[PDB]
């Protein structure tokens, strides 16, 4: 506030940035990252491969081609990416499994991505959709190992 009026702040620039991105991750706790990183990465994968499929690989690649006709390298990393979906897909399971296993009572931004996520239209990403629903309810009533403690109790 008192450093402001001069514009003598390029030392300050690399300290007000070096500090603001660290502090910006950390407001909502350890679940600031546990939300944020996986959620963004999820949309990263999701978005990529949702733009990826709207019909069939060839025609879709021509529509991709033509949205960014001049270059295809970002696209190629995309194309290259869905070549190994099954690799990707297992790891997708990994991500969801230990999130969805850890999580259960979360929030609108996520449930929003999930309802976005259910529309997913491909043979490899056929688990992920069923995962969307089974998770969304098993939220409401699970049988994982914590409520396995609860049923142990009931018994």
């Amino acid at each position: 506030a008192t450093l402001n009026r001069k514009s003598e702040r390029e030392v300050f620039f690399m300290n007000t940035q070096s500090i603001v991105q660290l502090v910006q991750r950390y407001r909502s706790g350890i679940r600031g990252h546990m939300k944020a990183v996986v959620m963004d990465l999820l949309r990263q994968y999701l978005r990529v491969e949702t733009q990826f499929q709207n019909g069939h690989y060839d025609k879709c690649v021509f529509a991709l081609r033509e949205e960014n006709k001049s270059d295809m390298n970002t696209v190629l990393n995309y194309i290259f990416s869905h070549a190994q979906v099954t690799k990707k897909n297992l790891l997708v399971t990994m991500l969801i499994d230990q999130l969805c296993g850890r999580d259960p009572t979360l929030t609108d931004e996520l449930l929003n991505i999930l309802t976005e996520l259910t529309q997913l239209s491909k043979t490899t990403n056929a688990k992920v959709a069923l995962r969307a629903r089974q998770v969304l309810i098993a939220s409401h009533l699970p049988s994982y190992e914590l409520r396995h403690n609860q049923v142990e109790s009931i018994f």
Partner: protein, 146 residues
């Protein structure tokens, strides 16, 4: 003269009359927007001084729009468009910063209670029974767990 005046800092710039209308128009509309948002921020957390708020808003801009674009703040037109493109989505897709504002607000309310309990820790139990009236089965388990 104005050269000296500006150099010494009691005014921010020397203008030319002919382009004064457009200039002042764009700046004022965004000056006004800034006031409106800061009002929202102050409501979100009374402890911040207006000054700290100023810096904070700039920081949120630099955060959202990028370190590369700091200079844009001094471009009347571009920040105005940026400010407007936030208040458009109500009861729909929410902005990250809106989430942040509730979070700071959340943090502050929590601290208020923290201070309150600090003055009066003995009150907890009776407060707690009511506190448990929500989330309760999980909450019982974690307390018992610990």
């Amino acid at each position: 003269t104005p050269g000296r005046m500006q150099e010494k800092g009691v005014i921010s710039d020397i203008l030319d009359w002919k382009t004064s209308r457009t200039f002042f128009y764009w700046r004022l509309r965004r000056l006004l927007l800034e006031d409106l948002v800061k009002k929202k921020i102050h409501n979100a957390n009374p402890e911040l001084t207006d000054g700290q708020i100023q810096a904070m808003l700039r920081r949120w801009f630099v955060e959202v729009e990028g370190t590369v674009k700091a200079y844009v703040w001094d471009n009347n037109k571009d920040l105005a468009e940026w400010l407007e493109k936030q208040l458009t989505e109500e009861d729909g897709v929410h902005s990250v910063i809106e989430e942040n504002i509730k979070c700071i607000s959340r943090d502050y309310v929590l601290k208020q209670i923290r201070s309150l309990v600090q003055a009066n820790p003995e009150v907890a139990m009776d407060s707690i029974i009511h506190m448990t009236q929500h989330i309760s089965p999980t909450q019982r388990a974690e307390v018992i767990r610990i």
